[PDB]
Amino acid sequence: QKSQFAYRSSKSIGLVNASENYASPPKFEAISEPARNACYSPNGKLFAYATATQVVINDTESGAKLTQLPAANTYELGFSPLGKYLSTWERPGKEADGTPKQNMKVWNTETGQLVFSFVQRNQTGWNLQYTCDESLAARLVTNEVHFYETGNMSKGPIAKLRVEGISDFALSPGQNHAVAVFIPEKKGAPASVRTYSIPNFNSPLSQKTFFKADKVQFKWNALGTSLLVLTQDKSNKNYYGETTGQFDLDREGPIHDVCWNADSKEFGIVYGYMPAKTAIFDNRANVVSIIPPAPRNTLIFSPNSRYILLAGFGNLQGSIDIFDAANNMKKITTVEAANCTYCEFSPDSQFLLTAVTSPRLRVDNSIKIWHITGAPMFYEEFNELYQAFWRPRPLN
């Protein structure tokens, strides 16, 4: 329909229908206060932006304001998978008497009701995780993991997890709800990774342990069946879990990016000291494609799982290449976006957005939308641009 994206600069904030000669939906206008943050719901039906005083939820079709949240001093925002809940991280603190304040609260989007409120100090892993049906939520306590019913989480944890000494965890986005958890290294014991079905707390699905591991990184695919695991000062190594006791490098050095494919059939890796080589796999850990060493640090799959992007960010001279899984890994396009700090396919995988953002860069902030062929369709100069992103659509 309309190729809509959002933008927020130091000067303004708005939604832009690229199919409409780049105009905003008629019923849209921001708050008195300057915006400090913004985001879309996973299905792109809603838009939220944060100002000092309040938080406003709009309709991405009309731009019409829908909901008002009395959330002040916010820094982070997050939509639940079906956008029926929105979480707001504030900066932590203590109450008049001395009580720690409820930094992050959960809100309803069609009633504007404060359903819940937690105390937290971290910004990393702040939000609740959710199932895809948005029926279950998950919080992280020392040496425990809590589960909730999203409909009625006020009553408390409907379920808890047995295992002890949990450092981080990650839910499954499959049809049937599953969990993946991690235990940091202690004395006389290595780190460990665990998977559980939510029905089965009693019966683990995987129980693996890992050494010289203080940290970890989980990467489920769209189908909650397979799961990548990454051990990460002196060394880094990459593992694989497939739920079920399943385990499955050509260049010595760091892995720069790890990414699944939208169809959950393939995945790729940007690894080793530069120029970084790139390898595409299958759901089995077998190579499909070997992209030769190039100055790249970032890999992205197109939503339609047809195109593969390979770029270099975090520095100047940032080019972009686009490869085609269907055409024998042909390259069809090479563009450059120097100092690009953000890049993303349009929902229909036909266009490509690039941007340069502050404070990751205080010079040359801009927006540029590209065809999949290489032909630009838009460009806009900013002084201090903060974010710019597509309005996500499902199964277009």
Residue numbers in the entry: 3 to 234, 238 to 248, 256 to 260, 265 to 412
Q: What are the paper's exact sentences on this?
A:
Since the C-terminal region of eIF2A is predicted to be highly disordered, we prepared a C-terminally truncated eIF2A (residues 1–424). We determined the crystal structure of the C-terminally truncated eIF2A at 2.5 Å resolution. The final model consists of residues 3–234, 242–248, and 256–412. The crystal structure of the truncated eIF2A revealed that it adopts a nine-bladed β-propeller fold, with the same overall topology as the regular β-propeller proteins, involving circularly arranged repeats of a four-stranded antiparallel β-sheet motif. There are two molecules of eIF2A-WD in the asymmetric unit, and no significant structural differences exist between them (the root-mean-square deviation is 0.98 Å for 391 Cα atoms), except for blade 6. The electron density of blade 6 is not well-defined, as compared to the other blades, due to either the crystal packing or the flexible nature of this blade (data not shown). A phylogenetic analysis revealed that the surface residues on the top face of eIF2A-WD, including these loops, are highly conserved, in contrast to the abundance of non-conserved residues on the bottom face. Especially, the residues at the top faces of blades 6–9 showed strong conservation. This highly conserved top face is positively charged, and the most positively-charged regions are the grooves between blades 3–4 and between blades 6–7.
Based on these findings, eIF2A might be a tRNA-loading factor in unconventional translation initiation events, such as non-AUG translation initiation, and an alternative factor of eIF2 when the active eIF2 is limited, due to the stress response by eIF2 kinases. eIF2A is predicted to contain two to four WD-repeats at the N-terminus and a coiled-coil at the C-terminus, but this prediction has not been structurally confirmed.
